[PDB]
Amino acid sequence: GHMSKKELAAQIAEKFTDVLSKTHAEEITNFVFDHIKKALVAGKEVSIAGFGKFAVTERAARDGRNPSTGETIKIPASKSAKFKAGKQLKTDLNN
Amino acid sequence: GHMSKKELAAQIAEKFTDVLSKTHAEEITNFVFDHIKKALVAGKEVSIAGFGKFAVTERAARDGRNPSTGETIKIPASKSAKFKAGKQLKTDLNN
Ligand code: NA
Ligand code: NA
């Protein structure tokens, strides 16, 4: 199965209709992930208790070879973000 | 740096004070991740546009050996959840 962000936001809106509208639920859901992204972009690890942690990772630069010339190259570094599932999520998935 | 769930919820509360209280911001932030967990527990992939995707993964069972006896064992399967950062997050981290 699948659950999208819009579906998440719709569930928020349905379960918190006393708190906020469907439009605000979508705004806030978008803000959750935007803010998490902003934090990763700022180099922060984002820890979400009961859920897990996000950290920026960097594929390190390293020596390669030009295959044709056997000249030393640099394979460039690049960043990504990694999630490590927390203990509670791991427990819930293994029940 | 670090950003926790409480800090995320506090940012939500600060930036959406017209929408919800600090208490509700924490409730909703907790619900976001609880609901995502519920979806993974239900076997759903959770796709969050602009952010990335979570999927349940299973470390497959496989043959091991009892080291001492050379009897065939089974190393048990276990589930976890994996996140794959979306293109936009990858772009933002590499800017
Ligand atoms: Na609305
Ligand atoms: Na409050």
XYZ file of N, CA and C and ligand atoms in Angstrom:
572
model
N 0.876 -1.216 0.000
C 0.000 0.000 0.000
C 0.875 1.215 0.000
N 0.171 2.329 -0.033
C 0.824 3.619 -0.174
C 0.121 4.656 0.613
N 0.896 5.578 1.232
C 0.304 6.725 1.807
C 1.131 7.905 1.392
N 0.493 8.899 0.773
C 1.168 10.099 0.327
C 1.109 11.220 1.384
N 1.851 12.309 1.126
C 1.727 13.434 1.978
C 0.325 13.992 2.058
N -0.350 13.995 0.928
C -1.730 14.553 0.910
C -2.624 13.677 1.727
N -2.381 12.393 1.694
C -3.171 11.487 2.467
C -2.874 11.641 3.960
N -1.603 11.852 4.300
C -1.247 12.147 5.660
C -1.934 13.417 6.106
N -1.824 14.486 5.323
C -2.428 15.717 5.716
C -3.960 15.561 5.892
N -4.555 14.770 4.971
C -6.003 14.517 5.098
C -6.300 13.799 6.390
N -5.459 12.880 6.834
C -5.715 12.222 8.090
C -5.582 13.152 9.265
N -4.591 14.014 9.213
C -4.466 15.048 10.220
C -5.742 15.905 10.274
N -6.218 16.308 9.091
C -7.362 17.186 9.054
C -8.538 16.427 9.631
N -8.661 15.152 9.310
C -9.829 14.396 9.785
C -9.771 14.171 11.299
N -8.598 13.965 11.828
C -8.477 13.643 13.215
C -8.273 14.815 14.102
N -8.097 16.005 13.535
C -7.928 17.167 14.349
C -8.816 18.267 13.812
N -10.053 17.926 13.481
C -10.928 18.949 12.930
C -11.231 20.003 13.968
N -11.053 19.760 15.265
C -11.293 20.800 16.244
C -10.130 21.781 16.233
N -8.995 21.364 15.671
C -7.789 22.178 15.748
C -7.640 22.948 14.484
N -7.799 22.359 13.318
C -7.446 23.048 12.126
C -8.173 22.566 10.947
N -8.267 23.390 9.927
C -8.901 23.058 8.698
C -8.089 22.156 7.796
N -8.677 21.657 6.760
C -7.991 20.837 5.780
C -6.872 21.628 5.136
N -7.119 22.891 4.873
C -6.079 23.710 4.289
C -4.916 23.900 5.256
N -5.185 24.159 6.500
C -4.128 24.296 7.412
C -3.435 22.990 7.691
N -4.162 21.906 7.672
C -3.500 20.623 7.874
C -2.522 20.378 6.770
N -2.877 20.714 5.538
C -1.910 20.551 4.488
C -0.758 21.492 4.664
N -1.005 22.732 5.021
C 0.094 23.676 5.243
C 1.003 23.200 6.316
N 0.491 22.707 7.401
C 1.326 22.319 8.471
C 2.058 21.075 8.112
N 1.410 20.121 7.451
C 2.118 18.922 7.047
C 3.258 19.307 6.138
N 3.030 20.218 5.203
C 4.130 20.635 4.333
C 5.188 21.291 5.173
N 4.792 22.046 6.194
C 5.808 22.726 6.994
C 6.632 21.729 7.782
N 6.058 20.659 8.292
C 6.815 19.679 8.993
C 8.023 19.256 8.174
N 7.780 18.887 6.920
C 8.851 18.312 6.141
C 9.740 19.394 5.605
N 9.187 20.569 5.361
C 10.054 21.643 4.926
C 10.974 22.002 6.036
N 10.496 22.016 7.270
C 11.301 22.430 8.332
C 12.382 21.380 8.621
N 12.044 20.113 8.511
C 13.002 19.064 8.651
C 14.063 19.205 7.546
N 13.647 19.422 6.301
C 14.613 19.682 5.294
C 15.454 20.881 5.619
N 14.867 21.962 6.067
C 15.689 23.143 6.372
C 16.708 22.776 7.405
N 16.341 22.049 8.422
C 17.295 21.631 9.418
C 18.393 20.762 8.861
N 18.089 19.814 7.962
C 19.161 19.035 7.364
C 20.039 19.875 6.515
N 19.449 20.805 5.779
C 20.244 21.701 4.935
C 21.161 22.528 5.794
N 20.732 22.881 6.991
C 21.565 23.598 7.931
C 22.580 22.750 8.623
N 22.595 21.471 8.291
C 23.586 20.512 8.841
C 23.162 19.901 10.126
N 21.894 20.088 10.523
C 21.469 19.509 11.774
C 21.021 18.078 11.629
N 21.222 17.264 12.632
C 20.593 15.985 12.679
C 19.193 16.237 13.235
N 18.218 15.572 12.667
C 16.879 15.750 13.135
C 16.460 14.475 13.810
N 16.186 14.545 15.095
C 15.814 13.367 15.843
C 14.385 13.473 16.176
N 13.621 12.444 15.841
C 12.225 12.462 16.112
C 11.954 11.274 17.033
N 11.737 11.643 18.296
C 11.532 10.574 19.303
C 10.391 9.663 18.888
N 10.649 8.401 19.026
C 9.669 7.378 18.700
C 9.643 7.008 17.260
N 10.419 7.730 16.481
C 10.342 7.536 15.028
C 11.703 7.176 14.478
N 12.617 8.149 14.542
C 13.970 7.908 14.140
C 14.695 9.199 13.922
N 15.846 9.084 13.289
C 16.728 10.216 13.130
C 17.083 10.399 11.679
N 17.177 11.640 11.267
C 17.683 11.987 9.933
C 18.968 12.692 10.112
N 19.917 12.346 9.288
C 21.232 13.008 9.269
C 21.637 13.177 7.817
N 22.344 14.269 7.602
C 22.990 14.475 6.333
C 24.215 13.608 6.317
N 24.374 12.989 5.149
C 25.460 12.099 4.895
C 26.175 12.708 3.708
N 27.452 12.367 3.616
C 28.195 12.802 2.418
C 28.926 11.593 1.886
N 28.643 11.261 0.625
C 29.449 10.292 -0.109
C 30.776 11.002 -0.294
N 31.823 10.440 0.293
C 33.090 11.123 0.295
C 33.623 11.175 -1.103
N 34.357 12.240 -1.378
C 35.157 12.242 -2.589
C 36.129 11.135 -2.510
N 36.554 10.602 -3.656
C 37.641 9.639 -3.593
C 38.280 9.573 -4.930
N 39.496 9.057 -4.894
C 40.260 8.802 -6.138
C 39.572 7.766 -6.997
N 39.382 8.124 -8.272
C 39.049 7.174 -9.338
C 40.178 7.227 -10.364
N 39.919 6.587 -11.483
C 40.823 6.666 -12.611
C 39.982 7.038 -13.773
N 40.495 7.962 -14.582
C 40.048 7.999 -15.978
C 40.352 6.654 -16.658
N 39.287 5.924 -17.063
C 39.416 4.562 -17.569
C 40.179 4.362 -18.847
N 40.218 5.435 -19.630
C 40.849 5.441 -20.670
C 42.326 5.870 -20.618
N 42.632 6.759 -19.685
C 43.924 7.403 -19.692
C 44.757 6.944 -18.499
N 44.094 6.321 -17.522
C 44.705 5.974 -16.237
C 45.232 7.210 -15.508
N 44.757 8.389 -15.913
C 44.950 9.589 -15.115
C 44.048 9.473 -13.870
N 44.639 9.875 -12.757
C 43.956 10.078 -11.489
C 42.896 11.184 -11.690
N 41.692 10.852 -11.224
C 40.515 11.733 -11.206
C 40.201 11.896 -9.711
N 39.227 12.749 -9.417
C 38.530 12.758 -8.149
C 37.091 12.449 -8.460
N 36.546 11.443 -7.780
C 35.116 11.227 -7.834
C 34.505 12.154 -6.781
N 33.528 12.976 -7.173
C 33.159 14.085 -6.323
C 32.337 13.604 -5.096
N 32.423 14.412 -4.059
C 31.595 14.198 -2.876
C 30.165 14.604 -3.211
N 29.181 14.000 -2.533
C 27.817 14.473 -2.689
C 27.141 14.174 -1.362
N 26.121 14.960 -1.072
C 25.415 14.846 0.172
C 24.079 14.187 -0.081
N 23.655 13.500 0.956
C 22.286 12.961 0.927
C 21.804 13.048 2.363
N 20.684 12.433 2.648
C 20.181 12.400 4.005
C 19.821 10.947 4.281
N 20.122 10.511 5.483
C 19.888 9.117 5.835
C 18.952 9.113 7.035
N 18.091 8.149 7.099
C 17.235 7.990 8.235
C 17.633 6.707 8.924
N 17.670 6.756 10.232
C 17.840 5.544 11.001
C 16.610 5.403 11.850
N 15.917 4.276 11.633
C 14.697 4.049 12.314
C 14.973 3.888 13.802
N 14.125 4.481 14.621
C 14.317 4.382 16.066
C 13.866 3.025 16.557
N 14.201 2.793 17.815
C 13.903 1.495 18.454
C 12.425 1.240 18.440
N 11.601 2.225 18.711
C 10.181 1.977 18.814
C 9.608 1.581 17.423
N 10.064 2.274 16.385
C 9.610 1.905 15.075
C 10.058 0.492 14.724
N 11.293 0.168 15.056
C 11.762 -1.178 14.805
C 10.974 -2.193 15.574
N 10.651 -1.872 16.835
C 9.822 -2.788 17.602
C 8.479 -2.948 16.914
N 7.844 -1.845 16.536
C 6.476 -1.894 15.976
C 6.476 -2.696 14.675
N 7.563 -2.639 13.916
C 7.590 -3.346 12.659
C 7.850 -4.803 12.827
N 8.341 -5.206 13.979
C 8.671 -6.592 14.206
C 7.711 -7.345 15.131
N 6.573 -6.725 15.368
C 5.530 -7.285 16.254
C 4.553 -8.211 15.535
N 24.632 20.356 14.383
C 23.471 20.840 15.198
C 22.446 19.751 15.258
N 21.405 20.093 15.989
C 20.356 19.134 16.288
C 19.030 19.790 16.312
N 17.995 19.085 15.798
C 16.670 19.538 15.989
C 15.851 18.351 16.401
N 15.175 18.454 17.545
C 14.340 17.387 18.056
C 12.872 17.540 17.609
N 12.063 16.508 17.894
C 10.674 16.646 17.647
C 10.029 17.796 18.385
N 10.461 17.996 19.613
C 9.861 19.090 20.423
C 10.227 20.406 19.817
N 11.414 20.497 19.278
C 11.835 21.711 18.652
C 11.076 21.942 17.344
N 10.839 20.869 16.591
C 10.015 20.965 15.418
C 8.627 21.425 15.802
N 8.013 20.778 16.787
C 6.689 21.155 17.165
C 6.635 22.635 17.622
N 7.697 23.036 18.357
C 7.758 24.447 18.785
C 7.824 25.358 17.585
N 8.524 24.991 16.525
C 8.554 25.837 15.359
C 7.223 25.908 14.663
N 6.546 24.783 14.589
C 5.193 24.775 14.074
C 4.301 25.727 14.887
N 4.411 25.629 16.217
C 3.549 26.425 17.056
C 3.892 27.880 16.812
N 5.167 28.193 16.672
C 5.551 29.602 16.510
C 5.106 30.151 15.152
N 5.155 29.338 14.134
C 4.855 29.808 12.818
C 3.435 29.651 12.418
N 2.623 28.992 13.238
C 1.241 28.843 12.910
C 0.415 29.173 14.133
N 0.768 30.251 14.817
C 0.018 30.585 16.018
C -1.400 30.968 15.669
N -1.727 31.334 14.431
C -3.102 31.643 14.098
C -3.889 30.349 13.959
N -3.185 29.230 13.785
C -3.857 27.970 13.494
C -3.993 27.190 14.753
N -2.974 27.060 15.575
C -3.051 26.142 16.657
C -2.166 26.492 17.773
N -2.475 26.004 18.953
C -1.696 26.215 20.124
C -0.434 25.385 20.197
N 0.416 25.666 21.129
C 1.629 24.902 21.349
C 1.281 23.467 21.684
N 0.239 23.279 22.463
C -0.164 21.929 22.793
C -0.662 21.184 21.559
N -1.451 21.809 20.739
C -1.886 21.152 19.578
C -0.778 20.955 18.579
N 0.148 21.872 18.518
C 1.266 21.670 17.605
C 2.038 20.456 18.009
N 2.239 20.248 19.302
C 2.912 19.041 19.696
C 2.079 17.834 19.393
N 0.792 17.875 19.649
C -0.067 16.731 19.331
C -0.032 16.418 17.880
N -0.096 17.392 17.025
C -0.143 17.122 15.641
C 1.187 16.646 15.175
N 2.279 17.229 15.658
C 3.586 16.747 15.256
C 3.719 15.299 15.656
N 3.286 14.940 16.855
C 3.371 13.534 17.252
C 2.501 12.721 16.337
N 1.351 13.256 15.933
C 0.473 12.460 15.079
C 1.095 12.252 13.713
N 1.792 13.218 13.153
C 2.430 13.035 11.895
C 3.256 11.759 11.900
N 4.110 11.619 12.910
C 5.045 10.519 12.886
C 4.372 9.257 13.336
N 3.378 9.373 14.198
C 2.666 8.169 14.571
C 1.937 7.651 13.385
N 1.356 8.522 12.575
C 0.587 8.077 11.498
C 1.491 7.471 10.415
N 2.652 8.051 10.196
C 3.608 7.502 9.291
C 4.040 6.115 9.799
N 4.349 5.988 11.086
C 4.624 4.692 11.598
C 3.471 3.753 11.397
N 2.260 4.173 11.668
C 1.131 3.248 11.486
C 1.094 2.796 10.060
N 1.282 3.672 9.115
C 1.302 3.277 7.729
C 2.408 2.307 7.405
N 3.625 2.493 7.939
C 4.666 1.509 7.692
C 4.344 0.205 8.319
N 3.779 0.238 9.516
C 3.399 -1.004 10.194
C 2.356 -1.725 9.385
N 1.490 -0.998 8.707
C 0.505 -1.587 7.827
C 1.047 -2.039 6.512
N 2.341 -1.854 6.321
C 3.043 -2.308 5.094
C 3.006 -1.311 3.993
N 2.569 -0.075 4.278
C 2.517 0.901 3.217
C 3.832 1.609 3.016
N 4.147 1.992 1.806
C 5.228 2.894 1.579
C 4.654 4.289 1.813
N 5.421 5.129 2.463
C 4.955 6.456 2.717
C 5.779 7.393 1.880
N 5.142 8.084 0.960
C 5.849 8.982 0.078
C 5.500 10.360 0.456
N 6.510 11.183 0.692
C 6.270 12.531 1.076
C 6.920 13.403 0.004
N 6.027 13.960 -0.816
C 6.539 14.773 -1.945
C 7.448 15.878 -1.438
N 8.543 16.010 -2.117
C 9.528 17.030 -1.792
C 10.479 16.628 -0.723
N 10.226 15.469 -0.153
C 11.020 15.065 1.013
C 11.686 13.733 0.753
N 10.854 12.691 0.656
C 11.348 11.391 0.319
C 10.338 10.338 0.651
N 10.803 9.105 0.638
C 9.922 7.971 0.796
C 10.410 7.085 1.910
N 9.480 6.542 2.657
C 9.781 5.521 3.668
C 9.169 4.254 3.219
N 9.908 3.191 3.368
C 9.424 1.836 3.055
C 9.928 0.908 4.143
N 9.093 -0.077 4.409
C 9.505 -1.166 5.256
C 10.387 -2.057 4.429
N 11.458 -2.465 5.105
C 12.452 -3.311 4.527
C 12.472 -4.533 5.420
N 12.917 -5.629 4.824
C 13.099 -6.837 5.652
C 14.471 -7.383 5.343
N 15.292 -7.499 6.388
C 16.541 -8.245 6.301
C 16.085 -9.683 6.137
N 16.419 -10.272 4.998
C 15.902 -11.581 4.696
C 16.499 -12.576 5.642
N 15.716 -13.601 5.937
C 16.298 -14.756 6.595
C 17.334 -15.325 5.713
N 18.340 -15.987 6.286
C 19.262 -16.701 5.420
C 19.948 -17.740 6.227
N 20.490 -18.691 5.488
C 21.314 -19.762 6.097
C 22.562 -19.194 6.731
N 22.775 -19.570 7.998
C 24.064 -19.417 8.682
C 24.545 -20.814 9.064
N 25.582 -20.825 9.871
C 26.067 -22.063 10.444
C 26.168 -21.818 11.902
N 25.726 -22.800 12.683
C 26.260 -22.909 14.044
C 27.786 -23.091 13.991
N 28.534 -22.097 14.523
C 29.986 -22.055 14.397
C 30.776 -23.151 15.054
N 30.151 -23.735 16.071
C 30.643 -24.679 16.663
C 30.349 -26.095 16.137
N 29.172 -26.256 15.553
C 28.695 -27.581 15.234
C 28.658 -27.786 13.722
N 28.746 -26.683 12.975
C 28.552 -26.684 11.523
C 27.168 -27.204 11.137
N 26.245 -27.217 12.101
C 24.837 -27.403 11.789
C 24.335 -26.116 11.105
N 23.541 -26.347 10.074
C 22.758 -25.328 9.393
C 21.769 -24.723 10.412
N 21.774 -23.390 10.427
C 20.883 -22.546 11.236
C 20.068 -21.766 10.192
N 19.099 -20.997 10.675
C 18.491 -19.917 9.929
C 18.791 -18.658 10.696
N 19.361 -17.672 10.006
C 19.467 -16.352 10.588
C 18.133 -15.655 10.314
N 17.487 -15.124 11.355
C 16.095 -14.763 11.209
C 15.935 -13.463 10.375
N 14.769 -13.368 9.769
C 14.387 -12.145 9.071
C 14.056 -11.081 10.110
N 14.231 -9.802 9.756
C 13.767 -8.750 10.642
C 13.413 -7.591 9.727
N 12.501 -6.765 10.210
C 12.014 -5.655 9.443
C 12.612 -4.379 9.991
N 12.750 -3.454 9.069
C 13.141 -2.099 9.489
C 12.407 -1.172 8.539
N 12.751 0.091 8.565
C 12.157 1.040 7.646
C 13.316 1.826 7.051
N 13.214 2.096 5.769
C 14.297 2.782 5.078
C 13.711 4.056 4.487
N 14.484 5.093 4.458
C 14.071 6.311 3.829
C 14.959 6.521 2.625
N 14.354 6.946 1.545
C 15.125 7.372 0.399
C 14.792 8.819 0.176
N 15.844 9.645 0.249
C 15.661 11.043 0.129
C 15.186 11.371 -1.279
N 14.234 12.280 -1.378
C 13.716 12.651 -2.692
C 14.690 13.572 -3.392
N 14.382 13.781 -4.662
C 15.250 14.603 -5.529
C 15.372 15.990 -4.972
N 14.305 16.583 -4.487
C 14.375 17.958 -4.050
C 15.285 18.072 -2.794
N 15.145 17.116 -1.882
C 16.006 17.146 -0.735
C 17.463 16.969 -1.146
N 17.706 16.058 -2.069
C 19.060 15.883 -2.547
C 19.581 17.122 -3.209
N 18.724 17.785 -3.998
C 19.153 19.035 -4.606
C 19.490 20.035 -3.515
N 18.611 20.195 -2.532
C 18.791 21.235 -1.497
C 20.073 20.967 -0.708
N 20.432 19.703 -0.527
C 21.612 19.404 0.246
C 22.870 19.594 -0.528
N 22.774 19.668 -1.838
C 23.948 19.798 -2.666
C 24.151 21.181 -3.289
N 23.404 22.136 -2.772
C 23.446 23.532 -3.257
C 24.512 24.383 -2.574
Na -9.868 24.089 4.410
Na -0.851 25.285 24.462
